[PDB]
Amino acid sequence: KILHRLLQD
Amino acid sequence: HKILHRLLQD
Amino acid sequence: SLALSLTADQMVSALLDAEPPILYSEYTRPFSEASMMGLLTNLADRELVHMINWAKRVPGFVDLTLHDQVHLLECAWLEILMIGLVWRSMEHPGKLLFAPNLLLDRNQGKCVEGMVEIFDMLLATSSRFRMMNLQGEEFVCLKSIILLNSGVYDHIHRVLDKITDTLIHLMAKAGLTLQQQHQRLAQLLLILSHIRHMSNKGMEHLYSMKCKNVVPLSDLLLEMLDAHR
Amino acid sequence: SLALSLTADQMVSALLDAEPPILYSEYDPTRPFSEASMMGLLTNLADRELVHMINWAKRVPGFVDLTLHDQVHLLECAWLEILMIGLVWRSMEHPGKLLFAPNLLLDRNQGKMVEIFDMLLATSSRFRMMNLQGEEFVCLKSIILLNSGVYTKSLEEKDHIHRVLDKITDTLIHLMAKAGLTLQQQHQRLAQLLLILSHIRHMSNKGMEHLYSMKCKNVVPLSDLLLEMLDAHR
Ligand SMILES: Oc1ccc(C(=C2CCc3ccccc3C2)c2ccc(O)cc2)cc1
Ligand SMILES: Oc1ccc(C(=C2CCc3ccccc3C2)c2ccc(O)cc2)cc1
């Protein structure tokens, strides 16, 4: 999940 | 014409 | 024009006087899509006739041209049906009171594809209204606001302002502080964004129901629906 | 806990500094058009704005206090609303035109969509006549992020969103009070601003339908992130 990544990273 | 046109009268 | 000369109490009593009645559905618990959408379509169709005569009694509305009245009703009708549904469903948590003889819960909305999502949102809004302890006088103010605002893109602006004055007036009369007043006001109006969302998602669902041609739509509903499509 | 501690002036200050930049499009006046090129341009543009939006959201007071699952949901719901109110804000001083980018300034006479365009035009026109302030705008955009997906186990989270929402309300009122507005004018302006959010929600929804239609018609590409975002609504 791309959006999930960017929030994390 | 539209049914709404008629109903918004009388 | 006469709308602006009205006082708050007068605004309130006029809106309460204009209220449409709660209609009944046909007198077996629906589960299939044909049965459920059949009952809801019949109901909405009858409700719409009352909505139109209600709308003509909302102060300021009659002062608009016929074409503008048509536009606003076409834009707002499902929103107005939905906030009505959500309001009368308040005292029945987890369920939607489409009519006093038609209480629907999640489990029936499980069938007919694309329904249970819109169902859940309506339940969440109803619950939100219940927790805020929304009052009937506030409800008719919100309903009026939806009618006048949803298809508004000067006179309407002034009337919209007048209704805001009325809302505040109601909260003040209820003994709320100034801070509580504009906080509660913001909360009410933010729910209007969700009612809009539910309407738009409902509208495409009804469009899907139409093209598939399972349930016969009334000519009035078909025209109200195509105004969006 | 940090968000509820802030003063209204601290809230504003925080929101102002979290503002993403205005990006450029790849538009070139010596380059031909058609619906493909334009939607491609806006898609490319939106896709880059998303990356800035995601990092902007993390700087919105209270947003990182939420679970990652909740943050994802709010953004999936609100992303187009937020792009659009961005579009409308920077289009204010350009009546009858939309400033997608500093180098991409479009009228209605270059469309087809035209109604979404007009709606955005009306909203911009509304901001202009209201004389919408920057401090009001950033409050509005943050409200959209927190509100739009809040009514769709534990939460807790949901009630926490209502607190920060409530804190952005006095901030707005606080803003209108220093502007010299009377109580009646404050209430009325607050209402006018929040009613605009219903229109922005409406434009977002109509926009997704056009975007979903655009994807299925496989006409010009959507990025991997834009596809995931769009799928959340479908
Ligand atoms: O008082 C009301 C009566 C009917 C409605 C209808 C909707 C339509 C969409 C929808 C989807 C899921 C759950 C509820 C609803 C409500 C509706 C409207 C028209 C129609 O032909 C069928 C259902 C809403 C309020
Ligand atoms: O800053 C912004 C950048 C792009 C947009 C996009 C929309 C999409 C819909 C739309 C239709 C007519 C006129 C404008 C718009 C705006 C948009 C969004 C996603 C996409 O893939 C294509 C266009 C809005 C604001």
Side-chain angles (χ1 to χ4, degrees), chain A residues 1-8, chain B residues 2-10, chain C residues 1-27 29-94 96-109 111-112 114-157 159-213 215-228, chain D residues 1 3-32 34 36-107 110-111 113-152 154 159-177 179-208 210-214 216 220-233:
Chain A
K1 201 67 167 185
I2 301 176
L3 180 57
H4 185 18
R5 277 220 330 264
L6 304 180
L7 268 317
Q8 259 181 352
Chain B
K2 300 171 181 175
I3 297 168
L4 195 52
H5 287 157
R6 179 173 67 76
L7 297 177
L8 276 161
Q9 301 186 11
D10 193 4
Chain C
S1 203
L2 185 48
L4 302 188
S5 299
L6 296 180
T7 63
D9 281 334
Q10 239 156 3
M11 185 61 63
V12 175
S13 76
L15 290 185
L16 291 174
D17 183 35
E19 267 305 271
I22 296 177
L23 304 185
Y24 280 82
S25 178
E26 284 83 307
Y27 50 85
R29 204 179 334 167
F31 274 95
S32 71
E33 170 209 290
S35 185
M36 176 143 51
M37 295 314 298
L39 295 176
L40 295 195
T41 290
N42 172 276
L43 175 61
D45 179 78
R46 289 183 278 114
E47 278 183 305
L48 269 178
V49 171
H50 288 274
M51 180 189 304
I52 293 163
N53 290 280
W54 163 80
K56 290 187 299 182
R57 292 184 52 78
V58 172
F61 190 78
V62 132
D63 304 322
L64 299 174
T65 69
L66 209 281
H67 300 309
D68 294 331
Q69 296 180 30
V70 169
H71 179 74
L72 295 182
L73 277 171
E74 286 174 334
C75 179
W77 69 272
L78 191 50
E79 293 193 76
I80 295 173
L81 283 185
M82 279 181 173
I83 188 182
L85 173 60
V86 156
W87 158 257
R88 59 189 191 267
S89 302
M90 267 183 57
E91 293 77 6
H92 306 259
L96 292 173
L97 198 147
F98 289 86
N101 63 338
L102 192 58
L103 246 179
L104 300 192
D105 62 31
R106 249 189 66 94
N107 294 338
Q108 316 125 358
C111 185
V112 43
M115 163 151 303
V116 79
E117 294 80 357
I118 306 177
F119 209 100
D120 285 338
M121 306 181 62
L122 290 166
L123 289 176
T125 309
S126 179
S127 180
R128 174 62 179 178
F129 276 0
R130 190 191 163 274
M131 295 311 301
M132 294 190 60
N133 196 33
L134 180 73
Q135 303 299 295
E137 294 85 351
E138 295 173 322
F139 160 70
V140 295
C141 280
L142 293 183
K143 196 159 58 168
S144 295
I145 286 177
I146 290 174
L147 177 64
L148 291 169
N149 174 69
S150 286
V152 79
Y153 300 137
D154 182 279
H155 167 78
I156 296 188
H157 291 83
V159 182
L160 279 172
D161 286 336
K162 189 45 131 287
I163 304 183
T164 295
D165 295 338
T166 307
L167 272 174
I168 292 300
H169 174 263
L170 291 168
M171 303 173 186
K173 173 137 62 179
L176 273 65
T177 65
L178 296 176
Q179 187 170 241
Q180 289 170 335
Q181 281 170 35
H182 56 58
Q183 276 184 355
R184 182 171 181 85
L185 175 61
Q187 291 166 6
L188 290 183
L189 297 179
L190 282 189
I191 296 166
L192 297 192
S193 174
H194 293 273
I195 284 172
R196 172 85 75 158
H197 189 258
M198 291 186 293
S199 176
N200 295 148
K201 305 299 289 180
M203 205 63 70
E204 44 193 276
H205 187 280
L206 290 179
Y207 171 86
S208 182
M209 181 188 72
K210 179 223 145 301
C211 295
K212 143 181 94 203
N213 207 335
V215 172
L217 286 71
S218 64
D219 293 323
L220 179 51
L221 263 66
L222 191 59
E223 292 187 343
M224 300 296 260
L225 181 63
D226 268 40
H228 282 257
Chain D
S1 82
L4 305 176
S5 172
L6 296 176
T7 76
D9 273 321
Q10 283 176 339
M11 178 67 63
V12 169
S13 151
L15 295 185
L16 286 179
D17 258 25
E19 273 299 292
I22 299 178
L23 302 183
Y24 281 85
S25 69
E26 231 145 46
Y27 173 75
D28 172 14
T30 69
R31 179 89 65 169
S34 72
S37 313
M38 295 314 302
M39 288 313 296
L41 277 174
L42 301 187
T43 298
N44 177 272
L45 178 66
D47 173 71
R48 284 175 291 126
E49 281 181 284
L50 281 176
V51 183
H52 291 267
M53 180 191 301
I54 294 162
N55 289 273
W56 158 85
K58 292 190 292 189
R59 296 183 66 175
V60 168
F63 189 79
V64 298
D65 294 336
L66 314 174
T67 69
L68 292 172
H69 187 280
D70 290 333
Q71 297 175 28
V72 168
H73 178 65
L74 291 177
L75 277 169
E76 288 182 345
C77 285
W79 68 269
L80 188 51
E81 276 184 85
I82 297 179
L83 287 177
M84 280 177 166
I85 195 181
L87 172 62
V88 167
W89 163 252
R90 59 180 183 263
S91 303
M92 282 187 59
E93 60 239 13
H94 303 280
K97 314 194 194 183
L98 290 181
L99 191 75
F100 294 95
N103 56 5
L104 188 49
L105 202 171
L106 292 175
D107 58 353
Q110 307 166 40
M113 142 172 288
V114 62
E115 244 149 63
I116 300 180
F117 214 104
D118 291 338
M119 280 190 288
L120 292 157
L121 285 179
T123 307
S124 179
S125 182
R126 172 62 158 155
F127 281 4
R128 184 162 51 252
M129 306 306 291
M130 286 198 62
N131 190 20
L132 181 71
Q133 301 293 301
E135 296 83 354
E136 297 180 309
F137 161 76
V138 291
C139 285
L140 287 190
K141 191 163 55 171
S142 296
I143 286 166
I144 290 180
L145 176 64
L146 291 159
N147 184 47
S148 289
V150 73
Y151 302 121
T152 53
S154 268
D159 210 327
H160 168 74
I161 301 179
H162 286 114
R163 268 146 213 130
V164 307
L165 268 180
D166 279 336
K167 196 137 205 313
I168 303 176
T169 290
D170 303 319
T171 301
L172 273 178
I173 290 297
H174 189 249
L175 285 168
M176 299 173 185
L181 275 66
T182 70
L183 269 55
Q184 181 172 7
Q185 291 181 338
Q186 288 174 47
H187 303 342
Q188 288 171 0
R189 185 173 183 82
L190 179 67
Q192 291 165 3
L193 290 188
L194 298 178
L195 283 188
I196 289 165
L197 298 194
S198 170
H199 294 277
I200 288 172
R201 171 85 74 155
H202 180 72
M203 290 181 292
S204 178
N205 297 335
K206 301 300 296 179
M208 297 285 189
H210 187 265
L211 287 180
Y212 177 87
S213 171
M214 203 178 69
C216 294
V220 276
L222 256 52
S223 57
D224 300 341
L225 175 58
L226 216 29
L227 272 164
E228 290 191 1
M229 294 285 202
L230 178 55
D231 277 37
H233 284 253

